[PDB]
Ligand binder design. Structure first.
Ligand SMILES: Cc1cc2nc3c(=O)[nH]c(=O)nc-3n(C[C@H](O)[C@H](O)[C@H](O)COP(=O)(O)OP(=O)(O)OC[C@H]3O[C@@H](n4cnc5c(N)ncnc54)[C@H](O)[C@@H]3O)c2cc1C
Length: 451
């Protein structure tokens, strides 16, 4: 049996562990955190994640989808809260079968942990990777107290998150060609209690958006009718716009409350613990880190956030991470050797990672800056018309990334053709009546091969 060592029992690591273990691999998985299935007296604070077709399919191949969806809240559409109009529900896709699932991060991790152990993988918690000696095929682990433990390894899988230790150790033997691109937006995670959401009639079966240009909020529901709310806001105010809102201006909960009362008046009543959550939770940072290569020979390979950290604006980090796990397991299982597997895995997935990394950055301007634009509404109306006339040619880019498994590079390449197509057809036209629908349909068939 081929042996594999996996660092990080996160989402990608536990999935790939399951897939290799049921294929007969001797799988050992190391995790720095304690086992979350051991119940303690601590009050865990977990957030919800948007599970889409890519992630759902990855769980389907692993035999875990039914179990995960049983604990997920169905989101049938996007609930846009734009001032001046009532909350507007925008259904997903074309039919009632296209939905996104809101799954609690902790619930999902437990299901994957159980899933990996049932396939035969061994999971070792409370052990963080410190360094790798690639020459001697050894690594060093330690607990929080710093007691060191050495282990032999044949194949090392880095599934240890944005701040991957496998990635850092790989940087000693190969130039990964890393380019960190930091994001000026930070995020703050707030809570809406079940009582609060019910009191203000917040739809449980929808994903909510409060667009506001350079800042915004999103909310995803949990099984108990609570919601986890993410505020996206500039870390600092630029000198060009010194009075623009930023986290630096929100020094306490009293400032945060006045900010929300003025800029999110319908959302602020639902934030019972806005003052407490604002000062007791850290302001998270966002970044896009790109790598030229993801592997060292047949010795080590990165996947998930370890290989391609991205901004969460498209809700696709986990989905891409689960998709990575399937591809990595497929290549490892069927290749002539580990080095051929790892080189082929990188070649297949690296272009798609750069694509979803790019599309995630663009999608912030789409959901927070465009959903209230007059030109964008006409382009969106015309794009929906093309999705019905050519259902296999004009698939809106959000549907391709979210509701299909088309490679991220194809979705971005087809999306730029559609974006430019809508841009030129709507240009210099006020109403949809002055737009020639059949000329737009002709260019759809000319430039977009059917799927
Ligand atoms: C605010 C926010 C919202 C998001 N929302 C969504 C969403 O709606 N949909 C979506 O698809 N994605 C979303 N994402 C992205 C998603 O959470 C991540 O992309 C996903 O968790 C990546 O999975 P992974 O297994 O690669 O890493 P992780 O899931 O982070 O797992 C990494 C694991 O490695 C462990 N580890 C780290 N260092 C070490 C070490 N040195 N030794 C041992 N173990 C180690 C960690 O403890 C952890 O268990 C969001 C991200 C953020 C920040």
């Amino acid at each position: 049996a081929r042996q594999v060592t996996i660092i990080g029992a996160g989402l990608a690591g536990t999935l790939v562990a399951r897939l290799l273990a049921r294929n007969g691999w001797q799988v050992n998985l190391f995790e720095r955190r304690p086992d979350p299935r051991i119940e303690t007296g601590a009050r865990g604070r977990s957030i919800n994640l948007a599970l889409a077709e890519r992630g759902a399919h990855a769980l389907r191949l692993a035999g875990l989808e039914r179990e995960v969806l049983a604990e997920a809240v169905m989101m049938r559409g996007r609930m846009v809260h734009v001032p001046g109009t009532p909350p507007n529900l925008q259904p997903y896709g074309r039919d009632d079968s296209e939905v996104i699932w809101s799954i609690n991060r902790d619930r999902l991790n437990r299901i994957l942990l159980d899933g990996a152990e049932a396939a035969g993988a061994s999971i070792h918690f409370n052990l963080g990777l410190d360094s790798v000696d690639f020459a001697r095929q050894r690594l060093t682990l330690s607990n929080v107290s710093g007691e060191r433990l050495e282990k032999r390894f044949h194949l090392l899988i880095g599934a240890d998150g944005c701040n991957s230790a496998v990635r850092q150790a790989m940087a000693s033997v190969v130039d990964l060609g890393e380019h960190l691109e930091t994001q000026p937006h930070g995020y703050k995670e707030l809570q809406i209690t079940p009582e609060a959401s019910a009191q203000f009639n917040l739809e449980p079966n929808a994903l909510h958006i409060w667009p506001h240009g350079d800042y915004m909020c999103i909310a995803l529901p949990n099984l108990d009718r609570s919601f986890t709310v993410t505020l996206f806001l500039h870390h600092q105010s630029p000198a060009a716009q010194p009075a623009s809102p930023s986290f630096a201006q929100l020094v306490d909960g009293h400032a945060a409350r006045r900010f929300f009362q003025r800029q999110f008046p319908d959302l602020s009543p639902m934030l019972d613990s806005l003052e407490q959550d604002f000062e007791h939770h850290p302001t998270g940072k966002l970044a896009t880190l790109r790598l030229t290569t993801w592997h060292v020979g047949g010795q080590a390979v990165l996947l998930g956030d370890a290989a391609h950290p991205m901004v969460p604006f498209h809700g696709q980090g986990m989905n891409c991470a689960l998709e990575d796990a399937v591809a990595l397991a497929e290549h490892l299982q069927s290749a002539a050797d580990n080095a051929s597997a790892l080189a082929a895995f990188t070649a297949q997935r690296q272009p798609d990672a750069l694509a979803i990394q790019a599309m995630a950055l663009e999608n912030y301007v789409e959901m927070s800056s465009k959903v209230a634009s007059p030109t964008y509404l006409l382009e969106r109306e015309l794009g929906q018309i093309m999705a019905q006339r050519q259902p296999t040619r004009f698939i809106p880019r959000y549907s391709m990334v979210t509701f299909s498994r088309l490679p991220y590079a194809q979705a971005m390449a087809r999306g730029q053709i559609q974006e430019q197509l809508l841009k030129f057809a709507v240009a210099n036209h006020s109403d949809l009546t002055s737009i020639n629908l059949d000329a737009v349909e002709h260019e759809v068939t000319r430039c977009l091969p059917p799927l």
